[PDB]
Structure 1
Amino acid sequence: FGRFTERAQKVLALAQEEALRLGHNNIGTEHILLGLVREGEGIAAKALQALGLGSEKIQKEVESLIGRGQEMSQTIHYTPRAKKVIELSMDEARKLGHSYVGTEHILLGLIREGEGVAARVLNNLGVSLNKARQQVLQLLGSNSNANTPTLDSLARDLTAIAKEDSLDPVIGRSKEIQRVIEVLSRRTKNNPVLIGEPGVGKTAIAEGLAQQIINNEVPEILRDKRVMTLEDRLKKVMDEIRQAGNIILFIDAKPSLARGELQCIGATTLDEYRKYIEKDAALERRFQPIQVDQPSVDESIQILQGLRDRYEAHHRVSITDDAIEAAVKLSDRYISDRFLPDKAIDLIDEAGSKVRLRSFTTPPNLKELEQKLDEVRKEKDAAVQSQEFEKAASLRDTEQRLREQVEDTKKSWKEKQGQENSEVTVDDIAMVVSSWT
């Protein structure tokens, strides 16, 4: 119903291997379970080895509750239960940040929907349901003074946060950064206010100081200094600071005021800043401005490639380079009413979907079979409640001829993934624009 590990995918098809090895006709939750302990190497497989549940012990209970074996094997499908069980492992992994399902999650997903044959194999093999979700769990896991208070989230620590080697590039606005520092030293117009048309770049300048203080060239006393970010918890945390002062605050959107320390970098617009200094005059005083020129066109390009990898998340990029060249250049002169790093990115996204979108569209003049198909099922129902079986079973053998019929032109539509899956070049990008201009 999507994409999982090999281990998942193998374990699933492996249920089918077991579907037939016993001759049954629908693969229920009991076969998914055989699937897991029989690929013997998944985390799922590993766990079962713990509870005391080899393939030996299990299959004996199962055959002791179903056995042979109508070799029918008339191209089988799932149990509705097990289809639920699959829908579930997908969720038992949203619930774990695991970007992709695998052997464990499916075992997780079975417990969750406990009503079914697997579940009974075990409540029969003296293995309550929770002792089991446990075993899988115990095989997966995770990944400071005043920081105590601050260190909510509100408002994450740019500094130590990017001290952990954990930081990327980052491309500037390299002289945008350093002007944040002439100001963040002064004693005059001390606290710098970051004015520029919104974005991106802006948040990237403070991720700068962060990068700069730490590794490491910086000056007029600024070491071991964090940059931190993002009402019934208000000035609360703010007192962990009037009592220790290694800290710049990064703002987004207000002034509880220079009652003392408080080093902050300003998130505000060409005009929005004039919504401080007019009522005055903490502005011409404390707070003090600097602008975000739109990042260098060429710098613009090698900015995406960094988050190219990370949007690879929708299927096409990484690549093409020839694909980005577009996004960026189009914007700088061809409308051309934003900021030279923000725009480009947006464009990708239109296409950063618009391709997996066009990918999962609908087959040819193959609409009317759906309509035909519809009434047959219908015609089938009416007669079964009239029964009239044969006079219908006719009609089932007949609905089903049309079923596998349409599929082989919808599964024949991974014939359509190819003609755009991970295809990328300007082709897709600029047609985007025929609208915006």
Structure 2
Amino acid sequence: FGRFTERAQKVLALAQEEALRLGHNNIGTEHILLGLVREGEGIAAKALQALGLGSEKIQKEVESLIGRGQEMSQTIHYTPRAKKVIELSMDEARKLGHSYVGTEHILLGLIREGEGVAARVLNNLGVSLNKARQQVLQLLGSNSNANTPTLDSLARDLTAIAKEDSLDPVIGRSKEIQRVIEVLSRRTKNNPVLIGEPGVGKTAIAEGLAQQIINNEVPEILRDKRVMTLEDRLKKVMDEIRQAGNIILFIDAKPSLARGELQCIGATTLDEYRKYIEKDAALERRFQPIQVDQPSVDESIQILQGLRDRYEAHHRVSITDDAIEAAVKLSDRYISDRFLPDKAIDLIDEAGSKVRLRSFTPNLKELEQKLDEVRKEKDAAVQSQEFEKAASLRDTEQRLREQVEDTKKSWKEKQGQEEVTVDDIAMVVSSWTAQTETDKLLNMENILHSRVIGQDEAVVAVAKAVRRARAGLKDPKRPIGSFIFLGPTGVGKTELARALAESIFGDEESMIRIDMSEYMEKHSTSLTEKVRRKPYSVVLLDAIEKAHPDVFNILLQVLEDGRLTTVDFRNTILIMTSNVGASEKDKVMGELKRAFRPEFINRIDEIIVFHEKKHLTEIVSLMSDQLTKRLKEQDLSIELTDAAKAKVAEEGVDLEYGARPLRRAIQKHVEDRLSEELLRGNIHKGQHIVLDVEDGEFVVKTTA
């Protein structure tokens, strides 16, 4: 039912050897017992030799209670009892740290489930059940002043605990450690408080002192000193200390107070510590702080490999190195709202399962269903008996049994296909957040062009700017891009912002949009919510000419630092629109310098200017397509001929109003008309409906 020693495995199959040597048909607990004393060398075997139970004495009792011997041997199986007995030895070893079952555990497992034939062999051979579990025990085993009290667990001894050679690496935070020691010597602000964003690292700093005092370089009196860890036992143990003082306490979460000794290292948060020194002033006194910088990126990497081995526990890692490289780097800059050693680890785990998960996900379900009723059909008849009329049905259930197996044991065909390398690691991430990823970049223009018509002047400026920042050149703390979009309305200002979101951030809808009409007065308090919500989004502020010059002091701070105080923009693409040019490239850039404070205009990455028939009709088509899709959902199939989109487009030529009119004119010439046409009974819906122009007039046609 798993994997044991040879000795186990041999003793088990050895039960079968005995299954047959007597001719019986099911191997019960009595055979497992013969199995043990008959491999004569297992600890299990050894024990029995103690109680006075050779193979001779036993098999005589057993044959004296079963004997021959239907040679049937029709491919036998277990007793349900003995199957329990096996399930048990597995547990009689969890209960011993024995990572693998063996001859003893099976003997242990038999006693535990004493109801059965083995048990009686012995209660018959005058060998009560406990005298027996004893003998096995006495053949296996194991592996201090005030520590008495302390040494509950509460709260395990970092020191002697890592004196036993038993300690690993450990990677720091190497200068994080030593600052725990300037403080842990003083006589002033004596007891050090470990403040840093939670984790991991933190617990690792104290596992440091531990490592340091012991092997061995340290100073201002600190040798033979333990570091210990983790209400009706309270100050109890704490007195074993006011009477012997080789001990630092490591805390997690309170002060029963410096009534004297008490050396402790502080587990607390940026702010949580200000939940001590305010009520004061044991803080500015005893307790005293120090911060956990996020461990070195490269140090970050060789931290996992240490616990790589130990998560190998779920099946894939160890490896790949190329797999970890991911986890760590992704986090440091790509969200990017934790601490540089904790994050990475978490990611693995998503995948530190997500792969054994995806592993145990063919169409081989329905046989189970078939199989089910057969057994069922079998049962009903046997209690009706009707044997043959069923035994049919058993010979028949069983054909299907060994059937499914050879596609479930054919699923160690699936162990093989999952192996460690980045393959498994990064797919993990496709959730938590390269050829056709830089191709989006090199080919951005091609890409933005298929959505934004006309406006090549603008697209190429943005393409290149994004590509600049996105390639390493611009400072990362500042947004990806800061632009101002000048030009008339309904030209593509917003439309480009969408296409940017879609191409750059993945979703035509990952776009925050404020209307600065709302912020014209000294009430200019932003936005920061929506940016905390999605910190990866085109941030579009429409018509900034309206904002109170206050606002600019804020945006200015964003442009400079890409941060507010305390939101983050380093991942946004800020786009601010305006009518400042409008009426009107030189006369324009002029009205701009006169409308906006220069300090501001100068911190903007780029000023984009938005200036054909063929573009109108390209738009009409975009719009028309959004429509024909949302109708297909309502079982309506429509199509506009290129001739028809032309005729709609005619309705946005007048330079004065631009391309606004098109949405309305589409609903009028298409929506309104199709309704009136469906209602009047001319188009039997769910046929195919085309809108065309005939003699310069709109016409509706059908072609199912």
Give the TM-score of the pair, scaled to structure 2.
0.59
Aligned partner of residue 207 in structure 2, secondary structure: helix
Note closer, same or farther for the CA distance 1:169–1:14 as it changes in structure 2 (3 Å cut): same
TM-fit CA distance, 1:156: 1.7
Note closer, same or farther for the CA distance 1:359–1:105 as it changes in structure 2 (3 Å cut): farther
Note closer, same or farther for the CA distance 1:10–1:354 as it changes in structure 2 (3 Å cut): farther
Instruction: Report matched runs for 1:261-276 at 5 Å.
Output: 261-276=261-276
CA contact (8 A) 2:155 2:229 kept: yes
Aligned partner of residue 135 in structure 1, secondary structure: helix
CA distance in structure 1 between the aligned counterparts of 2:219 and 2:425, rounded to whole angstroms: 44
TM-fit CA distance, 1:28: 1.0
CA distance in structure 2 between the aligned counterparts of 1:295 and 1:68, rounded to whole angstroms: 72
RCO higher in structure (CA 8 A, sep ≥6): 1
Aligned partner of residue 71 in structure 1, secondary structure: coil
- Bigger mean CA deviation after superposition, 13-22 or 107-116: 13-22
CA distance in structure 1 between the aligned counterparts of 2:125 and 2:3, rounded to whole angstroms: 32
Note closer, same or farther for the CA distance 1:32–1:358 as it changes in structure 2 (3 Å cut): farther
- Bigger mean CA deviation after superposition, 83-92 or 121-130: 121-130
**1:427 matched residue in structure 2:** 423
CA distance in structure 1 between the aligned counterparts of 2:21 and 2:358, rounded to whole angstroms: 40
**For structure 1, which runs of at least 5 residues remain unmatched after alignment?**
none
Alignment deviations for residues 263-293 of structure 1 (CA, whole Å, 9 cap, x no partner): 1110001111111112222212221111111
TM-fit CA distance, 1:345: 2.0
- Bigger mean CA deviation after superposition, 95-104 or 323-332: 323-332
CA contact (8 A) 2:354 2:428 kept: no
TM-fit CA distance, 1:89: 0.8
Alignment deviations for residues 49-81 of structure 1 (CA, whole Å, 9 cap, x no partner): 212222232223222322333232222211101
**1:296 matched residue in structure 2:** 296
Aligned partner of residue 153 in structure 1, secondary structure: coil
Note closer, same or farther for the CA distance 1:41–1:150 as it changes in structure 2 (3 Å cut): same
CA distance in structure 2 between the aligned counterparts of 1:367 and 1:161, rounded to whole angstroms: 52
CA distance in structure 2 between the aligned counterparts of 1:15 and 1:9, rounded to whole angstroms: 10
Note closer, same or farther for the CA distance 1:331–1:3 as it changes in structure 2 (3 Å cut): farther
**1:374 matched residue in structure 2:** 372
TM-fit CA distance, 1:112: 0.9
CA distance in structure 2 between the aligned counterparts of 1:418 and 1:22, rounded to whole angstroms: 41
CA distance in structure 1 between the aligned counterparts of 2:54 and 2:359, rounded to whole angstroms: 43
Alignment deviations for residues 182-211 of structure 1 (CA, whole Å, 9 cap, x no partner): 111122221111011111110110111111
Alignment deviations for residues 223-247 of structure 1 (CA, whole Å, 9 cap, x no partner): 2222111112222222222232222
Aligned partner of residue 387 in structure 1, secondary structure: coil
- Indicate the percent of aligned positions where both proteins have the same amino acid: 100
CA distance in structure 2 between the aligned counterparts of 1:24 and 1:326, rounded to whole angstroms: 59
**1:282 matched residue in structure 2:** 282
CA distance in structure 1 between the aligned counterparts of 2:42 and 2:183, rounded to whole angstroms: 56
**2:400 matched residue in structure 1:** 402
CA distance in structure 1 between the aligned counterparts of 2:344 and 2:8, rounded to whole angstroms: 37
Note closer, same or farther for the CA distance 1:4–1:218 as it changes in structure 2 (3 Å cut): same
Alignment deviations for residues 157-202 of structure 1 (CA, whole Å, 9 cap, x no partner): 2122222222221111100000111111122221111011111110
TM-fit CA distance, 1:369: 1.0
CA contact (8 A) 2:321 2:422 kept: no
CA distance in structure 1 between the aligned counterparts of 2:353 and 2:56, rounded to whole angstroms: 47
TM-fit CA distance, 1:392: 1.5
Aligned partner of residue 74 in structure 1, secondary structure: coil
Aligned partner of residue 187 in structure 1, secondary structure: coil
Note closer, same or farther for the CA distance 1:312–1:7 as it changes in structure 2 (3 Å cut): farther
CA distance in structure 2 between the aligned counterparts of 1:244 and 1:136, rounded to whole angstroms: 41
State how many pairs are aligned.
432
- Bigger mean CA deviation after superposition, 69-78 or 319-328: 319-328
Alignment deviations for residues 64-118 of structure 1 (CA, whole Å, 9 cap, x no partner): 3223332322222111010110111111112212222111111101111111111
Aligned partner of residue 252 in structure 1, secondary structure: coil
Note closer, same or farther for the CA distance 1:321–1:7 as it changes in structure 2 (3 Å cut): farther
Give the TM-score of the pair, scaled to structure 1.
0.94
**1:417 matched residue in structure 2:** 415
Note closer, same or farther for the CA distance 1:129–1:212 as it changes in structure 2 (3 Å cut): same
Alignment deviations for residues 377-436 of structure 1 (CA, whole Å, 9 cap, x no partner): 11112222222222112111211111111111111111111111xx11111111111111
Alignment deviations for residues 308-362 of structure 1 (CA, whole Å, 9 cap, x no partner): 23233333333333332232223222322221211222223233333344444xx
CA distance in structure 2 between the aligned counterparts of 1:20 and 1:40, rounded to whole angstroms: 19
CA contact (8 A) 2:318 2:420 kept: no
TM-fit CA distance, 1:141: 0.9
Note closer, same or farther for the CA distance 1:349–1:379 as it changes in structure 2 (3 Å cut): same
Alignment deviations for residues 111-153 of structure 1 (CA, whole Å, 9 cap, x no partner): 1111111112222222221111111011011123322222222
CA contact (8 A) 2:323 2:426 kept: no
CA distance in structure 2 between the aligned counterparts of 1:322 and 1:27, rounded to whole angstroms: 50
Aligned partner of residue 272 in structure 1, secondary structure: coil
- Bigger mean CA deviation after superposition, 235-244 or 187-196: 235-244
Aligned partner of residue 249 in structure 1, secondary structure: strand
- Bigger mean CA deviation after superposition, 296-305 or 187-196: 296-305
**1:335 matched residue in structure 2:** 335
